[PDB]
Amino acid sequence: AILTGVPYYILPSTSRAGFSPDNLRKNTSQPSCPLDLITQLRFPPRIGVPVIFTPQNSSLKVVPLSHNLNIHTCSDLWFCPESKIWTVKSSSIHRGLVVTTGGTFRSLGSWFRIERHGDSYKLVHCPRGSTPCRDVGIETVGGGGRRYLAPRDRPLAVRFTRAS
Amino acid sequence: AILTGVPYYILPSTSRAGFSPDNLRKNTSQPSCPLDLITQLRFPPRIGVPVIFTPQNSSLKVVPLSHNLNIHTCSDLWFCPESKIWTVKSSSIHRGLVVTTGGTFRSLGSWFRIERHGDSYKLVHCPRGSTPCRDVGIETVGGGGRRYLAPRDRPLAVRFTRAS
Ligand SMILES: *[C@@H]1O[C@H](CO)[C@@H](O[C@@H]2O[C@H](CO)[C@@H](O[C@@H]3O[C@H](CO)[C@@H](O)[C@H](O)[C@@H]3O)[C@H](O)[C@H]2NC(C)=O)[C@H](O[C@@H]2O[C@@H](C)[C@@H](O)[C@@H](O)[C@@H]2O)[C@H]1NC(C)=O
Ligand SMILES: *[C@@H]1O[C@H](CO)[C@@H](O)[C@H](O)[C@H]1NC(C)=O
Ligand SMILES: [Cl-]
Ligand SMILES: [Cl-]
């Protein structure tokens, strides 16, 4: 029921507090975005900015579970020079790997999968498009009060809302 | 001088018809942009969309001539999932190499230089950030009635107008 190329909001399974790339939150053009995190919109809870899933297998109209895909933010506004494509980067101040935008389609570090998590789903990131994959969850360390997505093997249960 | 991190319009030395990434001319969301050309705004001539130059030593305040740099489009609107960073791609439809957006900062394929050319300048693209470089000029083949930038060793003389 997740469709290739269609925008969805990623939301926590039990919450209305969705997610946005940092650059879209800050409303300001910058000359580079070395660590454009995906952060939760909490005060008040806001739906965030949708993403699109692109399976590694290009013929697929339905996004399969447990299979390599790219994610990218769907937004006509963009305040970074880098891409809208999600990837993972290491950050010393955030105490390890974090999800960011600025990736490259079909690159070795670009691969995520959607998996079942109880009655919901979870996102995982798969280095080099292979297992072992790390669960994507919410972290706070180094986030200056914000909650950001990171592949640290603690899953955040998510639901998808079609953005149409 | 040409200043780092300051937006400039690239213009032909003797014309007001500047340049824009194709996705900005279309002004609608795209699922992907495999070949986002930089095309000339001719009829009527319009100044285009500015760019920012980032020298390979990104700490320099003046952009050096004859020295590797990245170029990216300066725009808050962006209709592609891929980056605003310039690169070169092969296109059989366009009978060879073409300038496009969707590059990656500091990547092998990302390097251009600004060189003096007569009393004006030219852009060159430098495979792997090394010489020899190929002069960037204007082409029409496969362009559907538009002119696009391509590194085919016939230089377009250009000037740079600071955007404000
Ligand atoms: C070229 O493309 C851009 C980006 O799509 C257009 O700007 C966008 O126009 C929308 C209207 O078609 C604006 O949507 C409104 O947003 C608010 C708040 O989210 C809603 O409450 C409201 O009901 C609309 O949905 C959108 O904000 C705007 N985006 C940006 C970043 O500016 C642009 O349209 C032109 O400018 C804007 C400001 C509008 O006034 C349009 O009517 C106008 O055509 C497109 N340009 C052209 C020439 O078509
Ligand atoms: C960005 O714009 C939104 C919507 O106008 C606003 O509510 C928010 O506080 C702004 N963020 C910053 C950092 O200015
Ligand atoms: Cl990972
Ligand atoms: Cl070249």
Author numbering:
A (entry chain B), B (entry chain A): 1 to 164
Quoted from the paper:
The fold of CrataBL consists of a β-trefoil, typical for this protein family. To conclude, the sequence and three-dimensional structure of CrataBL show extensive similarity to protease inhibitors of the Kunitz-type, although the inhibitory activity is weak (in the micromolar range). A number of its biological properties have been characterized, including delay in clot formation by impairing the intrinsic pathway of coagulation cascade. In addition, CrataBL was shown to exhibit anti-inflammatory, analgesic, insecticidal, and anti-tumor activities.
The three-dimensional structure of CrataBL was determined in two crystal forms. Both of them were in space group C2 and contained two molecules in the asymmetric unit, but the unit cell parameters and crystal packing were different. Further analysis of glycosylation by mass spectrometry and protein sequence determination has shown the presence of N-linked oligosaccharides at Asn27 and Asn57. However, it is not clear whether the dimer observed in both crystal forms of CrataBL is biologically significant. There is no particular need for dimerization of a protease inhibitor, since Kunitz-P type inhibitors form 1∶1 complexes with their target enzymes. Since we were not able to obtain crystals of CrataBL with a target protease such as trypsin, the location of the reactive loop may only be predicted. However, the observation that CrataBL is slowly cleaved by trypsin between serines 58 and 59, located on a loop that is involved in direct interaction with the active site residues in trypsin and other serine proteases, lends credence to this assumption. Thus the detailed structural basis of the inhibition mode by CrataBL still needs to be verified.
